Amino acid sequence: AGSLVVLGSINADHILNLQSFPTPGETVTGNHYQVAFGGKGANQAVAAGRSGANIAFIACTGDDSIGESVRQQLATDNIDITPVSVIKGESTGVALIFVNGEGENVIGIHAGANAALSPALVEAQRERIANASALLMQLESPLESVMAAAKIAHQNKTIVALNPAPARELPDELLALVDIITPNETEAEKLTGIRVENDEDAAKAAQVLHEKGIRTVLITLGSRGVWASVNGEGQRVPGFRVQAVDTIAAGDTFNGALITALLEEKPLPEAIRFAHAAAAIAVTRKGAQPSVPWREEIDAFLDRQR
Amino acid sequence: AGSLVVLGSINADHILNLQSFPTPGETVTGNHYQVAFGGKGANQAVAAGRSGANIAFIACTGDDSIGESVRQQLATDNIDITPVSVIKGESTGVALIFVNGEGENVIGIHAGANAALSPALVEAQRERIANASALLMQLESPLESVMAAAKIAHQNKTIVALNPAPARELPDELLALVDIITPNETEAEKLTGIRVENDEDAAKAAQVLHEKGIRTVLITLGSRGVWASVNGEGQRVPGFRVQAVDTIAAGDTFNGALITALLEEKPLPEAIRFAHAAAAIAVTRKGAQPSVPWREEIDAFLDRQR
Numbered sequence: 235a236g237s238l239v240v241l242g243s244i245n246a247d248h249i250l251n252l253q254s255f256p257t258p259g260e261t262v263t264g265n266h267y268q269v270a271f272g273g274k275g276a277n278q279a280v281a282a283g284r285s286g287a288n289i290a291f292i293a294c295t296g297d298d299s300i301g302e303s304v305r306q307q308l309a310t311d312n313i314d315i316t317p318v319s320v321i322k323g324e325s326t327g328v329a330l331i332f333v334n335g336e337g338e339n340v341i342g343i344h345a346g347a348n349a350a351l352s353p354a355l356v357e358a359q360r361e362r363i364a365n366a367s368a369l370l371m372q373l374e375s376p377l378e379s380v381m382a383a384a385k386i387a388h389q390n391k392t393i394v395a396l397n398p399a400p401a402r403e404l405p406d407e408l409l410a411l412v413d414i415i416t417p418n419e420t421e422a423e424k425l426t427g428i429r430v431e432n433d434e435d436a437a438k439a440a441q442v443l444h445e446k447g448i449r450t451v452l453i454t455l456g457s458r459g460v461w462a463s464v465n466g467e468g469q470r471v472p473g474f475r476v477q478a479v480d481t482i483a484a485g486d487t488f489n490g491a492l493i494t495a496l497l498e499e500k501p502l503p504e505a506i507r508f509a510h511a512a513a514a515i516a517v518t519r520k521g522a523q524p525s526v527p528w529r530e531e532i533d534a535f536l537d538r539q540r
Numbered sequence: 541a542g543s544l545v546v547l548g549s550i551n552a553d554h555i556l557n558l559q560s561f562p563t564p565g566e567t568v569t570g571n572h573y574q575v576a577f578g579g580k581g582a583n584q585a586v587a588a589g590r591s592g593a594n595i596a597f598i599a600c601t602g603d604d605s606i607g608e609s610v611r612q613q614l615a616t617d618n619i620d621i622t623p624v625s626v627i628k629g630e631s632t633g634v635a636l637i638f639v640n641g642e643g644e645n646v647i648g649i650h651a652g653a654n655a656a657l658s659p660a661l662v663e664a665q666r667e668r669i670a671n672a673s674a675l676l677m678q679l680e681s682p683l684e685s686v687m688a689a690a691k692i693a694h695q696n697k698t699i700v701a702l703n704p705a706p707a708r709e710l711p712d713e714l715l716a717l718v719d720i721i722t723p724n725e726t727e728a729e730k731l732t733g734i735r736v737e738n739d740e741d742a743a744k745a746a747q748v749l750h751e752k753g754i755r756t757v758l759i760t761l762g763s764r765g766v767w768a769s770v771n772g773e774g775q776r777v778p779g780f781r782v783q784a785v786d787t788i789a790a791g792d793t794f795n796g797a798l799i800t801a802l803l804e805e806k807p808l809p810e811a812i813r814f815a816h817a818a819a820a821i822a823v824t825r826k827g828a829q830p831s832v833p834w835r836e837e838i839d840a841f842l843d844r845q846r
C-alpha cells in the first residue's frame with residue numbers, strides 16, 4: 235500500500251451520557267462521564283492506523299498534561315507521530331459532548347493548539363506530503379493550512395481527500411484541489427445549497443461538487459449508506475444493518491478506513507464496503523476514538539457478512 | 541444576623557461560549573473556553589458569603605486536583621469550609637455547559653463525589669444544622685440527604701429554604717418540611733403540574749405549594765422578577781432592568797443573597813430587592829461562580845437605584 239498523511243485536529247473529549255439533550259436554560263443530570271482523546275484528525279488517523287494504513291499524522295497539541303500524553307497513545311495505533319508538534323504555552327483543543335439515550339450526540343469544540351497548525355508548519359512538511367500517496371484532512375484545522383496542504387499535494391499528484399466537517403462553505407480555490415470529498419447530508423447542503431434527503435438530491439449535490447473540480451464525491455447518508463459518484467456516474471452503497479448504541483466517530487471511522495482500503499488498491503465500491511464495516515462496528519460501541527475498530531475485527535465482520 | 545448552613549453540590553464547570561447551541565448530530569466551533577469552580581450548592585454558598593452571610597457549607601468534593609483546590613478557594617469567599625468533606629477514591633462532580641450568543645446556557649451534570657453526601661454525613665452535622673437559623677439546599681445532592689437535613693432543621697426550628705433545581709417531582713414528605721421554596725417557572729410546573737406563564741398561573745402554582753405545607757413561595761419569572769406569596773397573599777416584585785450578557789448563576793445568586801438579607805432581618809420584599817440587585821449584577825457578568833457579586837457592589841448598585 236502507498237503512504238497516507240492525515241492532517242487535522244487533536245481534542246480532549248469530555249463526554250457526558252444523558253437521557254435527553256438539555257433545552258435552553260435547563261440543567262439535566264447525566265450519567266456516565268469520560269475524558270478521552272479525540273478530534274476528527276486524530277480519530278481518522280487512528281481509524282487508518284488501526285485498519286492497516288501506513289500513516290503519519292500532522293497535528294498540533296498543547297503542552298498541558300493531555301497534550302503530553304496523547305502522542306504516546308497515538309503511536310500505539312500504528313501512527314507515525316513525528317509530525318505531531320507540541321505547542322508550548324498553549325492547551326490542547328477541547329470538545330464538550332453530550333450523548334443521548336438514543337446514541338445521538340451534540341458537540342461544541344474549542345480550537346486551542348489546533349489553531350497553531352499553520353501554513354508554515356504545513357510548509358515544513360512539504361516533502362512528506364509530496365511523497366505520500368494520499369492526504370486526508372478535515373475542517374477542525376485552520377482553513378489556510380488545509381489550503382496550503384491541498385496545494386502541495388495537488389502539485390505532487392498526492393490524492394487529496396477532504397472530509398468537510400464540521401460544515402462550512404469553502405472557497406472554490408480549495409474545492410478545485412480536492413480529489414475525494416466526503417460530506418454528510420448537512421455538509422453537502424452547506425457546500426452546494428442543495429438539501430439532500432434522497433438519492434435524487436444526492437446526485438444533484440454531487441454534480442455541483444463535480445462542477446467544482448472534484449472527481450469522486452461520496453455523500454454519506456447515515457443508516458442509508460453512501461451516495462458514491464465518480465465524475466457524474468453515481469450509485470448508493472448501503473451500509474450494514476446494526477444496533478446503534480453510540481453514533482459518534484462513525485464518519486471519522488468511515489474516512490480513515492476508506493482511505494486505507496483505497497491505498498491497498500481496492501476499487502472504490504469495495505473500499506466503501508470495508509469502511510462501512512469499520513463504521514458499523516464503531517456505532518455499536520461507546521465513545522468516539524475508543525470505538526474505532528482494528529483490522530482483524532473489520533475482516534471478521536466482513537467474513538461473517540453473507 | 542443568624543447563621544446559615546448551605547448543603548449542596550460542588551462541580552468543576554467546563555464552559556464553552558458559542559454562537560448557537562449545537563443541534564443533534566452537529567459539531568459547532570465555539571470560542572472562549574473556561575474551567576471554573578461551580579455547582580448550585582457552591583454558587584449559593586459563595587453568593588451568601590460574598591453578600592455578608594455568616595455561612596458554613598456541607599458538601600463533598602473528590603480528591604482529584606480540582607477537589608483539593610476548591611476548599612481553599614471557597615474559604616476566601618467568607619465560607620466556613622469545615623463541613624466540606626474530601627471523598628477519597630472519587631472525582632469532583634462535573635458540569636459541561638454551553639453558553640450561546642444571547643447569554644442563554646444549557647447544562648449537563650455528572651454527580652461524582654456530590655453523590656457521597658449521604659444521610660450519614662448529614663447526621664454527623666446534626667448540631668450544626670440544629671444551631672443554624674437557616675438551611676439552604678438545592679437538588680444537586682441526593683434526595684435522601686436533602687430529606688435528612690430538612691428533618692433535622694424542621695425539628696430545631698431552623699428555617700428550611702429549598703431551591704428546587706434542577707427540576708424534579710418531590711415527595712410530599714419533603715415539601716411539608718420546607719419553609720421557603722424558590723422554583724423557577726419550569727420547576728413550579730414540575731412540582732404542581734401548573735404551567736406558569738403569567739401572574740395568574742403563578743398564584744395558582746403557589747397555592748398548590750402552600751397546600752403542601754410551604755408558607756413562603758417565591759416563583760422566579762426570569763426578567764419579570766418574582767411572584768412572592770406568603771400563605772396565600774401574593775405580589776410580583778420586578779427585578780432590575782439590565783443588559784444581560786450571561787444569565788448563568790442568576791438563580792444561585794438570587795438564593796444566596798436572598799437568605800443573607802432575611803437573616804439580617806430585612807422583611808421579605810426588601811430581601812427580594814437585595815437579591816434581585818445581586819442577581820442583576822451577576823447576569824451582566826461572564827461565567828457562573830465568578831459572576832457572583834460582593835456586598836459592597838450590591839449596595840453600590842442599590843444606592844444608584846433611584
Ligand SMILES: Nc1ncnc2c1ncn2[C@@H]1O[C@H](COP(=O)(O)OP(=O)(O)O)[C@@H](O)[C@H]1O
Binds near residue numbers: 399418
Ligand atoms: N445507524 C447506523 N448503522 C450503521 N452504519 C451507520 C449508521 N450510521 C452511520 N453509519 C456509518 O457511518 C457512516 C457515516 O454516517 P453519517 O451519519 O452519514 O456520518 P457523520 O457521523 O460523519 O455525520 C455511514 O456511511 C455508515 O458507514
Ligand SMILES: Nc1ncnc2c1ncn2[C@@H]1O[C@H](COP(=O)(O)OP(=O)(O)O)[C@@H](O)[C@H]1O
Binds near residue numbers: 762815820
Ligand atoms: N434578564 C435578567 N435581567 C435582570 N435580572 C434577571 C434577569 N434574568 C434573571 N434575573 C434575575 O435572576 C433571578 C432568577 O432568574 P430565573 O431565570 O427565573 O432563574 P434561574 O436562572 O434559576 O432559571 C430573577 O428573579 C432576577 O433576580
Ligand SMILES: OC[C@H]1O[C@H](O)[C@H](O)[C@@H]1O
Binds near residue numbers: 245272277328343482
Ligand atoms: O467526530 C467526533 C469528534 O468530533 C469532535 O472533534 C470531537 O473531538 C470528537 O472526537
Ligand SMILES: OC[C@H]1O[C@H](O)[C@H](O)[C@@H]1O
Binds near residue numbers: 551579
Ligand atoms: O446554576 C449554575 C450551576 O448549575 C450547574 O450546577 C453548574 O455546575 C453551574 O455552576
